[PDB]
Write a protein that binds this ligand. Structure first.
Ligand code: CM2
Length: 175
């Protein structure tokens, strides 16, 4: 391996949603926008929308399930997000069970809980530092104002246009 990556931005460029409400953030969210240093536009085979479901467990950790449509099937990915240093931040539970992963951070940047959200993730895997930002929607469509905003924020973190995509709405699996 030889890879080049846009550097993760310093945490100080990533706002935190104030007064984060874990109970209201629960439920299903669609990924209407996706940006990151390992995210690449692929005009030939554009990326399909997928969904991520947050369920609060009794201990207040989230059970996180992502579902995507691939090879005619629904693929499910499950992880645990445990509360971090402040409300709206999380780290990954059982980091141990993933070979090569030494750090994982989740920070809710902003959300109104019933329509949209922007979430920043940063991780270190096989010693490479990765980051992405998701534009989450309670519905598969969001105003063009929210999309531009997500675009400005992604760029403010060093990401150019070809590292920012808007997955295509589908009906399979995510409904
Ligand atoms: O996207 C969300 O809404 C939030 C997430 C919650 C669930 C956790 C799924 C588990 C692990 C994981 O997510 Fe992934 O998550 C990241 C977190 C922080 C920084 C960068 C990334 C990623 N992930 C993407 C990626 O390409 N990962 C690798 C390496 C794959 C294993 C490590 N990654 O990279 C890969 O080859 O994946 C193939 C594509 C695929 O289907 N994977 C999807 C799985 C479902 C959620 C979307 N996603 O985010 C994917 O990776 C690109 O940047």
């Amino acid at each position: 391996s030889t890879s080049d990556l846009i550097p993760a931005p310093p945490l100080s460029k990533v706002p935190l949603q104030q007064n984060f409400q874990d109970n209201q953030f629960q439920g299903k969210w669609y990924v209407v926008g996706l940006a990151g240093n390992a995210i690449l536009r692929e005009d030939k085979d554009p990326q399909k929308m997928y969904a991520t479901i947050y369920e609060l467990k009794e201990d207040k950790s989230y059970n996180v399930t992502s579902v995507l449509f691939r090879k005619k099937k629904c693929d499910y990915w499950i992880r645990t997000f445990v509360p971090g240093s402040q409300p709206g931040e999380f780290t990954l539970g059982n980091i141990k069970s993933y070979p090569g992963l030494t750090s994982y951070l989740v920070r809710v940047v902003s959300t109104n809980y019933n329509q949209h959200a922007m979430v920043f993730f940063k991780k270190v895997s096989q010693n490479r530092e990765y980051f992405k930002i998701t534009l989450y929607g309670r519905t598969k469509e969001l105003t063009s104002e929210l999309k531009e905003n997500f675009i400005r924020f992604s760029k403010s973190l060093g990401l150019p246009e070809n590292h920012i995509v808007f997955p295509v709405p589908i009906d399979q699996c995510i409904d």
